[PDB]
């Protein structure tokens, strides 16, 4: 856990300023399981 | 009336339309009118009753109008051309030239996925029409009888159309899978024609060996294979080599990357073309040059990692068979030269050593040699290495003519093979060796000896070679005493040390167990010092054409040169060159002082002295430039009395080059005649441009001259720790040099204006008072005359450099 | 090999020196340290550079991109070599000779012909300022040389060649601007690439009109993207919800050939800052504040949004072809928004709070060349738009279209000035029981300049 600004385009540390590009969304924690569809997969009889 | 109308059109209308051709550019809103004009003029070009001049006028008008139209406006005419050109009848020169110009000018529109500027991108229909044009012309020209005029104008059309299509263009129109790509079908057709040509060449060889002189039944197929197919393959893989060299890991090309089957086809094509001319050079005759050029361009497209990792067994067997065949041919050539024939010698000269050199350079550049030269291929490389060393170091009639090529091939092999053949003692620590991988039973089955010291019995070890080179450099020997040491042993040693420095003690600060080599930067520094001593010994001799080679082979070891080489090797060599330069300039001035007498012979002698001086300077200067580029930051952070002397000598030589008129002319003549590539020395992305045209006179430029570049790089050493008062004195002395003053007048003006050193106390430059606090060289008593001399030298160098570079900007 | 699409220009952040520091002569030097090696550009910009165009893609910037080793001005070319994290790019401009030089870690970058000049023979015009563009998750540091001893490679290359720091002999820090992605309605210029607005004076039988048409539709230069149009002035509701006409009216006329199912007509509050390629009326930002009692019984429910519109597809479903007339009516005394279609009253109605500014707005995707027109007429017991907007025309029954009324379109990216000082916020973890701490003690203020009609 940490505390952060919501939006920042610069970061000042020890009198030195870093310019920042746009960052994407982080720590979404959205699993959303997507198993491979095996409903239409038909086993051959010789593999039975 | 028809003839009168033809005279009116070909004398008044169509020359006017030819002159007003650039006004047809940008006619975006007039597509119907321009399309109807193109259709009608193309119809008129197929005139039933026209004179030759009238038809030439119509064809010139159509070419000039179509040269200024964007490709989206030409499509209705190309739909007619895709039906008319594959007939290949008479009056086909104009459509072929139109297609050639169109697809050579507008290749980025069809090939690049980012388009061509603001013109846009090609739609699927345009690419389909382009591919249909290619296959129509190709299938027509394959079955056509041999015509030297039709082929000469149909080959550039095929090369232009093929070079415009993307290699991964899928045409999903029946009468998707990766078999539908254009490169796949093209490679399949080429492979089929190559197999058919193999059978035809075998039959022709049987006919020649029979002794008969009858015409071959397959003369048309041989003519189509040699006069059309091979240049088409060569140009196609010149244009699209990065497509077949790319992988998902490294995106070398913007078009994409080839599939596994396409790379397998490329490797198979290279192997089959190499096996097609294994001894049939005199059979090919004048087509051997085209075959060797095609094999050169195919040797640089080999992605052998993917082929050996995911490929068919036949293609891998073909590659290993190519290496084994090269080893066998080299062994046969060596045995024929030891026993005191012409076919093997000629094949080795013109079609084995250059292709092996290209293969080894390709696997060294892309680092394929670690995963390729393993096992049987490594044994074949051992045989190749032994044969090349025995041929290069021998004393025969053939050796004295082909020693540079043997040295080049040996140095190419030395930078690619993953075993330390000069250090067989530590071979137990090399996991990539065939001795550390294969069992002794397997190596007994293969027939190779069970000891690693028996693989190269005639090749000396690293210590013996280095001691030999040191003893030859310290003895002041000439090139006549050591031809094979300079031209065979030294390039191989440079490439070997450059390769095995990275896999040794100094490159790895962790131990990571024992190393398979003992190469450190000390060996590279000693070898570079020996090279500099060898060049210093042979200064001022008449003929030395080995200097332009030793300046190129010695490059990869300059990055590990230790800083003790400046006071011992670079400064004395540059001092000798500077003394020779001042003597030659003084002789030229005292010759030009006299306006009477027989001055022609003296002028020729001065010109020869200048040529010798320029040859020695271009031998010595690339090494100095690389050394300065590597050590300049360390010289700037801690000034010394050696880098200042280096700048002083370089500035004096540059000033002499500026003043003398013969110096620049002889330097330019040396660079142009010897084809010295200065940009290779100066430089140290993707092939998105196609610069086929080249000029030999464009090889030289004043900006790329090494004499200018040495000062341009050493001038930060001169302009170091200069206070604002020193900068004011330098500006004053440059102003005095602008009035064409001598050195003593400039120094007298600087002596009479010493108060400008107070300019460092001005507040407006107060920001400069702490920039050089890090350096420790700001501790010396103040001397006026030393400052005068230093400011004069800096000002002269800067003024002459600016005077040289001012016309260059233009 | 599934490859994602390229990053939009709205997500690339531009940093820039203020135009008042632009230099027209001299030799100037600055540095750009690349903390995170990647997609970044650095160079010199003219006053007139736009934040929605890639740097160097036009004639307004001269930049170097070290991710691919390219130079950009009116296109791109190959130049120099690629950089690494921790590198420093030294940029020098020489307006006396009109040349630009780039260095990487103190070493001169050269072209394919060996020349050290990346750009040469340009026009000075207004001047140049330092500019850089950073991509996604990129970090860079621009050093302008307020303290020249903080430079890394100035003494190696640049100091003795005559180049001065950009911020040399300056007492205060150079003001900086950045590119902000906040879509705002801006008036349509005469040189707009896609939208043309024609003003039609009101005759005795026809109301004054603002006709919006598309320029490049039906050609090869067509851009069939969503267009968000607004009127320049708002209509404000009364301060208390409880001179005999308190209703305002305006109309839209959709011309034949324009699909009514691709047109949304209505009102927008000043806080509408949404730009998208696909517009849906169900994606509108809406909240509901419910105020009750101590017994948990709902007493009041206020619904808030920023876009009160109707969709023409629902109008077609409820009812080339004919022109469609859509009328919007506001009761200012009650704050009630209602709609009508060809005289037939629709079932859509909205309730707004007191002191709510609403702008007329049309969101549409162009399917023709003559898009629509604003009809600023009047009805019985309904003021025209100019009567409600302007208090001078409040008693005037004649509809008018004053020149302050204009059509505006959404512009996504703008320039915003970086503040000279920021709040000093200190964050720490006190204890596992005490939690996390935020504090801010030192006061900081700014002078706000407020545009009243835009709020």
């Amino acid at each position: 856990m940490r505390l952060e600004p919501v939006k920042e385009y610069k970061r000042d540390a020890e009198g030195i300023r870093d310019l920042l590009g746009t960052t994407q969304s982080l720590s979404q924690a959205s699993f959303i399981p997507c198993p491979i569809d095996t409903s239409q997969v038909v086993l051959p009889p010789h593999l039975e | 009336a028809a003839l009168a109308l033809n005279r009116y059109l070909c004398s008044a209308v169509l020359p006017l339309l030819t002159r007003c051709a650039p006004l047809f550019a940008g006619t975006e809103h007039y597509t119907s009118l321009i399309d109807s004009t193109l259709q009608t003029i193309y119809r008129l070009s197929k005139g039933r009753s026209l004179t030759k001049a009238q038809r030439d006028t119509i064809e010139e008008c159509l070419l000039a109008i179509c040269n200024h139209l964007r490709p989206s406006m030409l499509q209705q005419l190309l739909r007619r051309l895709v039906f008319d050109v594959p007939q290949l009848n008479e009056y086909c020169k104009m459509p072929l030239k139109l297609l050639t110009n169109h697809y050579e000018q507008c290749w980025k529109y069809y090939c690049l996925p980012s388009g061509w500027g603001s013109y846009g991108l090609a739609v699927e229909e345009e690419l389909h029409l382009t591919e249909k044009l290619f296959w129509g012309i190709f299938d027509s020209l394959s079955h056509k009888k041999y015509d030297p005029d039709l082929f000469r104008m149909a080959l550039p059309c095929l090369s232009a159309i093929a070079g415009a299509l993307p290699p991964d263009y899928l045409d999903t129109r029946i009468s998707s899978s990766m078999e539908k790509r254009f490169a796949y079908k093209f490679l399949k057709k080429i492979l089929k024609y190559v197999d058919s040509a193999q059978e035809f060449i075998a039959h022709l060889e049987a006919i020649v060996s029979s002794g008969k002189t009858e015409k071959s039944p397959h003369d048309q197929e041989i003519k189509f294979f040699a006069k059309v197919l091979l240049p088409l393959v060569d140009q196609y893989f010149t244009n699209h080599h990065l497509y077949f060299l790319s992988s998902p890991l490294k995106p070398l090309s913007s078009s994409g990357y080839a599939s596994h089957k396409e790379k397998e086809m490329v490797a198979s094509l290279f192997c089959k073309l190499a096996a097609l001319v294994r001894h049939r050079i005199s059979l090919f005759g004048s087509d051997s040059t085209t075959m060797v050029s095609c094999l050169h361009i195919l040797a640089q497209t080999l992605d052998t990692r993917t082929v050996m990792k995911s490929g068919s067994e036949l293609v891998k067997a073909g590659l290993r068979a190519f290496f084994e065949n090269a080893a066998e041919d080299l062994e046969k050539t060596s045995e024929n030269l030891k026993l005191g024939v012409s076919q093997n010698i000629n094949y080795t000269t013109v079609a084995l050593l250059p292709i092996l050199t290209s293969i080894f350079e390709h696997v060294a550049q892309h680092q394929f040699g670690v995963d390729l030269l393993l096992g049987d291929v490594q044994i074949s490389c051992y045989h190749i290495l032994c044969s090349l060393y025995s041929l290069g170091t021998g004393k025969n009639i053939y050796v004295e003519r082909q020693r540079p090529a043997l040295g080049e091939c040996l140095a190419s092999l030395a930078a690619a093979i993953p075993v330390a053949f000069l250090e067989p003692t530590l071979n137990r620590y090399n996991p990539l060796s065939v001795f550390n991988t294969k069992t002794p039973r397997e190596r007994s089955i293969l027939g190779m000896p069970d000891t690693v010291e028996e693989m190269c019995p005639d090749i000396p070890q690293l210590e013996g070679l280095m001691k030999e080179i040191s003893d030859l450099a310290e003895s002041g020997a000439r090139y006549t005493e050591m031809p094979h040491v300079i031209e065979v042993i030294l390039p191989m040693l440079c490439n070997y040390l450059s390769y095995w420095w990275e896999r040794g003690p100094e490159h790895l600060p962790p131990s990571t167990g024992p190393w398979c080599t003992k190469v450190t930067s000390e060996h590279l520094s000693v070898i570079l010092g020996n090279i500099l001593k060898i060049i210093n010994n042979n200064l001022g001799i008449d003929e030395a054409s080995w200097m332009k080679r030793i300046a190129v082979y010695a490059q990869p070891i300059i990055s590990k040169a230790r800083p003790d080489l400046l006071k011992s090797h670079f400064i004395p060599t540059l001092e000798k060159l500077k003394k020779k330069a001042v003597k030659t300039v003084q002789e030229e001035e005292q010759l030009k002082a006299d306006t009477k007498g027989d001055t022609q012979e003296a002028e020729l002698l001065i010109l020869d002295e200048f040529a010798v001086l320029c040859r020695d300077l271009y031998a010595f200067y690339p090494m100095l430039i690389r050394y300065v580029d590597n050590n300049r930051s360390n010289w700037l952070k801690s000034p010394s009395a050696d880098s200042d002397q280096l700048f002083r000598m370089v500035a004096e030589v540059f000033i002499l080059w500026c003043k003398s008129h013969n110096f620049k002319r002889e330097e330019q003549n040396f660079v142009i005649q010897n084809e010295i590539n200065n940009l290779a020395f100066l430089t140290g992305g993707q092939d998105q441009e196609r610069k086929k045209t080249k000029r030999r006179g464009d090889l030289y430029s004043i900006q790329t001259s090494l004499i200018v570049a040495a000062l341009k790089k050493m001038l930060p050493i001169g302009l170091n720790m200069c206070t604002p008062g020193d900068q004011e004195l330098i500006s004053l002395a440059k102003s005095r040099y602008s009035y064409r003053d001598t050195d003593e007048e400039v120094k007298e003006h600087l002596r009479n204006n010493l108060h400008l050193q107070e300019k460092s106390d001005d507040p407006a430059v107060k920001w400069q008072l702490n920039l050089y606090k890090d350096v420790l060289k700001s501790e010396e008593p103040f001397n006026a005359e030393k400052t005068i001399e230093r400011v004069q030298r800096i000002s002269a160098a800067v003024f002459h450099l600016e005077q040289v570079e001012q016309p260059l900007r233009s | 090999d599934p490859a994602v699409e390229k990053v939009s220009i709205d997500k690339i952040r531009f940093f820039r020196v203020e135009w008042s520091y632009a230099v027209r002569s001299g030799k100037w030097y600055f540095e750009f340290e690349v903390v995170t090696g990647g997609d970044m550009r650095v160079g010199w910009a003219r006053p007139g550079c736009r934040p929605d165009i890639e740097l160097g893609a036009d004639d307004q910037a001269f930049v170097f991109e070290g991710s691919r080793g390219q130079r950009w001005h009116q296109g791109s070319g190959y130049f120099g070599r690629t950089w690494q994290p921790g590198d420093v790019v030294g940029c020098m401009i020489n307006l006396d000779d009109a040349s630009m030089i780039f260095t990487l870690n103190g070493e001169l970058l050269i072209t394919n012909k060996g020349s050290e000049l990346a750009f040469a023979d340009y026009e000075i015009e207004n001047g140049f300022v330092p500019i850089c563009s950073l991509g996604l998750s990129q970090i860079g540091r621009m050093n302008l040389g307020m303290d020249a001893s903080t430079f890394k490679f100035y003494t190696m290359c640049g100091l003795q060649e005559g180049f001065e720091p950009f911020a040399v002999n300056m007492n205060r820090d150079v003001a900086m601007w950045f590119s902000k992605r906040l879509p705002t309605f801006v008036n349509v210029p005469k040189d707009h690439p896609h939208i043309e607005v024609v003003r039609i004076d009101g005759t005795m039988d026809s109301p004054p009109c603002l006709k919006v048409t598309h320029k490049t539709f039906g050609t090869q230069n067509s851009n069939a993207s969503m267009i968000y149009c607004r009127l320049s002035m708002p209509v404000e509701c009364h301060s208390s919800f409880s001179h005999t006409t308190t209703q305002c009216y305006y109309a839209i006329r959709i011309f034949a050939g324009q699909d009514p199912s691709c047109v949304w007509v209505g009102w927008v509050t000043p806080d509408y800052h949404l730009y998208s390629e696909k517009f849906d009326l169900n994606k509108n930002c809406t909240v509901t504040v419910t105020l009750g009692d101590e017994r948990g019984r709902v007493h009041e429910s206020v619904k808030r949004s920023n876009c009160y519109m109707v969709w023409g597809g629902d109008i077609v479903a409820t009812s080339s072809n004919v022109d469609l007339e859509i009328g919007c009516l506001v009761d200012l005394a009650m704050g009630m928004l209602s709609f009508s279609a060809n005289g037939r009253e629709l079932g859509t109605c909205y309730q707004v709070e007191p002191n709510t500014k609403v702008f007329p707005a049309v969101f549409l995707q162009p399917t023709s060349t003559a898009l629509f027109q604003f009809e600023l007429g009047k009805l019985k017991n309904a003021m025209p738009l100019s009567a409600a907007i302007f208090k001078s025309e409040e008693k005037n029954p004649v509809p008018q279209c004053p020149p302050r009324l204009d059509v505006q379109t959404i512009q996504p990216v703008l320039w915003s000035r970086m503040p000279s000082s920021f709040l000093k916020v200190e964050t720490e973890r006190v204890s596992e029981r005490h939690g996390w701490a935020v504090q801010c003690l030192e006061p900081l203020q700014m002078m706000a300049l407020h545009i009243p009609e835009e709020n």
Side-chain angles (χ1 to χ4, degrees), chain C residues 199 207-210 229-237 245-252 265-268 326-332 337-339 356-362 372-379 381-390 392-393 395-408:
Chain C
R199 312 181 72 94
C209 295
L210 285 170
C229 289
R230 203 187 62 172
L231 280 185
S232 178
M233 300 299 302
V235 171
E236 191 169 354
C237 297
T245 300
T246 59
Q247 301 180 8
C248 180
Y249 175 82
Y250 94 98
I252 218 65
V265 176
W267 309 86
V268 287
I326 305 175
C328 313
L329 180 80
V330 180
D331 191 7
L332 297 168
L337 319 180
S338 57
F339 298 88
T356 299
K357 301 184 176 63
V358 280
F359 295 80
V362 170
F372 65 99
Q373 66 175 21
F374 283 95
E375 296 187 345
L376 311 177
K378 64 175 299 180
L379 304 184
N381 304 272
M383 301 181 304
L385 207 74
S386 57
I389 290 178
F390 304 98
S392 178
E393 301 290 320
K395 43 95 178 182
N396 185 24
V398 183
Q400 296 181 3
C401 181
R404 205 183 179 188
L405 269 184
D406 202 0
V407 182
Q408 307 176 316

Side-chain angles (χ1 to χ4, degrees), chain B residues 110 143 151 230 272 376 482 509 540 624 655-656 663 699 797 803:
Chain B
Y110 297 94
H143 303 300
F151 280 15
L230 294 177
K272 288 175 182 180
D376 321 7
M482 39 186 299
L624 180 74
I655 283 162
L656 294 164
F663 211 149
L699 289 184
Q803 187 182 0

Side-chain angles (χ1 to χ4, degrees), chain B residues 679 685 703 712 719 772 809, chain C residues 78 97-98 116 121 160:
Chain B
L679 285 90
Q703 196 168 202
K712 204 169 177 177
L719 280 163
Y772 293 102
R809 197 176 187 273
Chain C
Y78 280 96
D97 301 5
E116 75 192 46
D121 301 350
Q160 308 288 344

Side-chain angles (χ1 to χ4, degrees), chain B residues 257 633 636-637 679 682-683 685 688 703-704 712 716 719 721-722 727 764 767-768 770-772 809, chain C residues 78 97-99 110 114-117 120-121 148-149 154-156 159-161 164-165 168-169:
Chain B
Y257 55 91
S633 61
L636 286 174
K637 290 180 181 179
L679 285 90
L682 295 183
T683 297
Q688 216 171 5
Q703 196 168 202
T704 52
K712 204 169 177 177
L719 280 163
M721 299 177 302
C722 273
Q727 298 174 24
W767 59 275
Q768 302 192 212
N770 293 130
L771 300 184
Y772 293 102
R809 197 176 187 273
Chain C
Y78 280 96
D97 301 5
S99 57
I110 54 182
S115 184
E116 75 192 46
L117 269 58
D121 301 350
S149 60
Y154 184 50
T155 52
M156 294 188 176
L159 170 59
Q160 308 288 344
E161 283 77 23
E164 287 179 336
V168 74
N169 287 331

Side-chain angles (χ1 to χ4, degrees), chain C residues 9 33 55 62 93 101 114 117 128 156 192-193 196 207-208 216 291 302 329 339 344 347 381 428 433 439 443:
Chain C
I9 192 50
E33 180 187 4
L55 232 48
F62 303 77
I93 192 173
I101 300 175
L117 269 58
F128 301 94
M156 294 188 176
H192 198 277
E196 190 169 358
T216 60
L291 306 167
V302 180
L329 180 80
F339 298 88
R344 170 179 58 99
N381 304 272
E428 73 171 359
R433 183 179 182 179
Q439 71 170 18

Side-chain angles (χ1 to χ4, degrees), chain B residues 433-440 442-449 451-466 468-473 475-541 544-591 593-594 597 599 602 604-685 688 690 697-703:
Chain B
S433 185
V434 73
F435 291 88
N436 299 10
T437 296
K438 290 189 178 179
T439 70
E442 288 169 337
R443 290 183 280 101
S444 302
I445 287 177
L446 294 177
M448 60 180 313
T451 319
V452 79
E453 280 78 10
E454 309 175 10
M455 293 302 299
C456 302
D458 296 359
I459 301 182
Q461 304 201 18
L462 179 61
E463 304 93 330
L465 284 184
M466 287 196 63
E468 169 184 8
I469 294 175
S470 177
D471 290 0
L472 285 175
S475 304
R478 295 294 183 270
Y479 167 75
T480 57
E481 307 182 28
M482 39 186 299
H484 71 283
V485 183
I486 295 177
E487 285 185 336
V488 170
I489 299 180
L490 207 44
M492 178 202 68
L493 195 55
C494 289
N495 279 42
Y496 178 88
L497 291 179
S498 175
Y499 185 85
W500 285 105
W501 184 91
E502 302 183 6
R503 296 152 188 85
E506 286 197 6
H507 183 253
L508 287 318
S511 297
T512 71
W515 304 276
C516 44
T517 186
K518 53 201 168 187
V519 171
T520 60
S521 51
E522 186 262 359
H523 299 92
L524 278 75
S525 174
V526 164
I527 287 302
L528 184 57
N530 293 329
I531 291 175
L532 290 168
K533 230 295 181 180
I534 284 170
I535 285 185
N536 187 32
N537 289 328
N538 315 125
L539 282 187
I541 67 177
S545 57
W546 50 270
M547 285 179 156
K548 52 184 175 183
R549 306 183 190 100
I550 206 56
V552 180
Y553 287 121
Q555 299 295 102
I557 66 172
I558 306 178
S559 304
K560 310 305 175 312
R562 289 185 172 179
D564 68 319
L565 294 186
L566 183 55
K567 207 176 61 60
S568 56
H569 289 106
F570 281 100
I571 282 180
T573 312
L574 185 52
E575 186 169 339
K576 277 199 181 181
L577 286 170
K578 185 201 63 178
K579 288 179 60 180
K580 217 272 189 177
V582 301
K583 186 173 66 64
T584 315
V585 168
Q586 177 179 346
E587 288 171 13
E588 181 209 25
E589 288 183 2
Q590 78 174 13
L591 169 63
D594 299 355
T599 60
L604 294 186
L605 261 57
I606 289 303
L607 261 50
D608 293 0
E609 288 275 62
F610 270 134
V612 168
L613 176 65
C614 289
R615 186 199 73 238
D616 302 1
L617 276 175
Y618 266 69
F620 171 69
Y621 257 38
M623 313 177 180
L624 180 74
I625 281 179
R626 292 295 175 87
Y627 188 76
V628 163
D629 273 349
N630 290 131
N631 298 269
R632 185 171 52 168
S633 61
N634 310 119
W635 292 343
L636 286 174
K637 290 180 181 179
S638 61
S640 179
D642 293 324
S643 51
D644 301 3
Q645 186 178 356
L646 188 66
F647 161 72
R648 177 174 316 122
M649 293 180 301
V650 167
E652 283 178 320
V653 174
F654 173 76
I655 283 162
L656 294 164
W657 179 84
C658 288
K659 293 185 180 306
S660 292
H661 167 261
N662 298 317
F663 211 149
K664 317 166 175 294
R665 187 69 55 84
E666 289 303 313
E667 182 209 31
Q668 172 175 6
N669 285 20
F670 179 84
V671 173
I672 290 180
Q673 289 303 313
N674 303 44
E675 290 192 358
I676 304 297
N677 190 21
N678 282 325
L679 285 90
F681 295 135
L682 295 183
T683 297
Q688 216 171 5
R690 300 175 179 176
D698 200 78
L699 289 184
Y700 181 79
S701 182
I702 307 180
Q703 196 168 202

Side-chain angles (χ1 to χ4, degrees), chain C residues 126-185:
Chain C
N126 306 20
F128 301 94
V129 303
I131 199 170
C132 69
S133 83
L134 315 190
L136 302 173
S137 303
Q138 297 309 303
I139 307 178
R141 302 194 183 105
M142 183 186 297
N143 192 3
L144 297 182
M146 287 282 296
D147 193 4
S149 60
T150 61
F151 276 149
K152 301 301 178 183
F153 307 100
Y154 184 50
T155 52
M156 294 188 176
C157 193
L159 170 59
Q160 308 288 344
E161 283 77 23
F163 296 91
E164 287 179 336
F166 183 80
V168 74
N169 287 331
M170 285 182 178
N171 291 325
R172 58 188 189 274
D173 289 356
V174 175
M176 298 280 299
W177 293 61
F178 67 103
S179 66
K180 184 198 294 183
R181 202 264 181 184
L182 184 68
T184 317
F185 293 94

